Write a protein that binds this ligand. Structure first.
Ligand SMILES: Cc1cn([C@H]2C[C@H](O)[C@@H](COP(=O)(O)OP(=O)(O)O[C@H]3O[C@@H](C)[C@H](O)[C@@H](O)[C@H]3O)O2)c(=O)[nH]c1=O
Ligand SMILES: Cc1cn([C@H]2C[C@H](O)[C@@H](COP(=O)(O)OP(=O)(O)O[C@H]3O[C@@H](C)[C@H](O)[C@@H](O)[C@H]3O)O2)c(=O)[nH]c1=O
Ligand code: NI
Lengths: 196, 195
């Protein structure tokens, strides 16, 4: 228990962003390395992982591999995300609420390694910056991406200084051409109750 | 080269009915890479069985292992979809433990992030690590319980009667539990009632 190994499975809500949850994940170590149940439906529903994730019976698992200082975000595609780390690496995770209402623009940040996971509700922008030499970032989502639909998706620029966030190393961030060109928050229309 | 940019595709394994091997598209750039490791809408048409979702049960496991580590051979009563989540590499190994014409049949192949495998219940799964480290990630459709482990099917990795060859047997690093699994001779073929 505590730093990395042997934590008790547990969940905490994030007060600034309704619907978000942070989980402590049990990681069991031995001579070989380690093992975790990254996601376990039966054990996690009683802790607050939302049953609504399963509404349409859709499932996709993505994995990205990234080097130190790489920054990906901030992206608010129209689906829920369950995010964690799959190797020995570490990221600074960062979130900005894009939903219409009293929490528009609210933020949260925390360090994520293999012993922590995050549930991100649809309408909350996701991003991270790599702290370790490399990292494998693995996530479960409940709708299907298509290239031609990207203009329909919500994004916000990582470097908008008006956002209440602080990156690890903004100056040395390694980003995509796309992430360089996303709009500032002032040009993002708040998202209505799942588009209504 | 043969890591990036593969067409999404599936192939059967002749020796082990129900197994599938997939080529997975991996897209590289200045940051690293990205893959859709599993995508339900795209994979069902290729042969990924709808029955995997019959009960609504879902678990995702990850193990992290160092060079020469060997884990297996394990045939628990659920289906498995397996791949690599980092830049590492393993030798994958399968032994069919099901009652019938294919009992004892085997397959082996190298797995990196650009390949995945569907393993039906009753086929024992294992691997040996070829790279410095590897992250091995899998999706399964029933729930492991410590109390029930004595009832799950296992076969010993080092039984020379198995029609397999490991990368480095003499320097393999295994768990005590894996040292002690039964030899093939002592494993009763698994009936549908057992799975
Ligand atoms: C998101 C996605 C990308 N791709 C492809 C398109 C590109 O060739 C390659 C990389 O795509 P990019 O959009 O540059 O990946 P990215 O890692 O910058 O995008 C991701 O960022 C995270 C912070 C978000 O949470 C994710 O939802 C996603 O937007 O992968 C897919 O095939 N399927 C997908 O679902
Ligand atoms: C399999 C499993 C293990 N554990 C725990 C029990 C131990 O403290 C720790 C390590 O367990 P071990 O049984 O030594 O892990 P292992 O990595 O040797 O076991 C795995 O081997 C693969 C080849 C099989 O395909 C898998 O089904 C599984 O059996 O993880 C879980 O909490 N949940 C699980 O689902
Ligand atoms: Ni609930």
């Amino acid at each position: 228990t505590e730093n990395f190994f042997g934590k008790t499975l547990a969940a905490r809500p994030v007060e600034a962003i309704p619907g978000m949850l942070e989980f402590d994940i049990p990681v069991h170590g031995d001579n070989r390395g380690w093992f975790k149940e990254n996601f376990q439906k039966e054990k996690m529903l009683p802790l607050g992982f939302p049953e609504s994730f399963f509404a349409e019976g859709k499932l996709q698992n993505n994995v990205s591999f990234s080097r130190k200082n790489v920054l990906r975000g901030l992206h608010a595609e129209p689906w829920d995300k369950y995010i964690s780390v799959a190797d020995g690496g570490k990221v600074l995770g960062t979130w900005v609420d894009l939903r219409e209402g009293e929490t528009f623009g609210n933020t949260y940040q925390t360090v994520i390694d293999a012993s922590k996971s995050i549930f991100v509700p649809r309408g909350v922008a996701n991003g991270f910056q790599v702290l370790s030499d490399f990292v494998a970032y693995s996530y479960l989502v409940n709708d299907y991406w298509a290239l031609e639909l990207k203009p329909k998706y919500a994004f916000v620029n990582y470097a908008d200084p008006s956002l209440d966030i602080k990156w690890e190393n903004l100056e040395e961030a390694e980003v995509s051409e796309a992430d360089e060109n996303h709009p500032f928050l002032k040009d993002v229309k708040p998202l209505r109750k799942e588009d209504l």
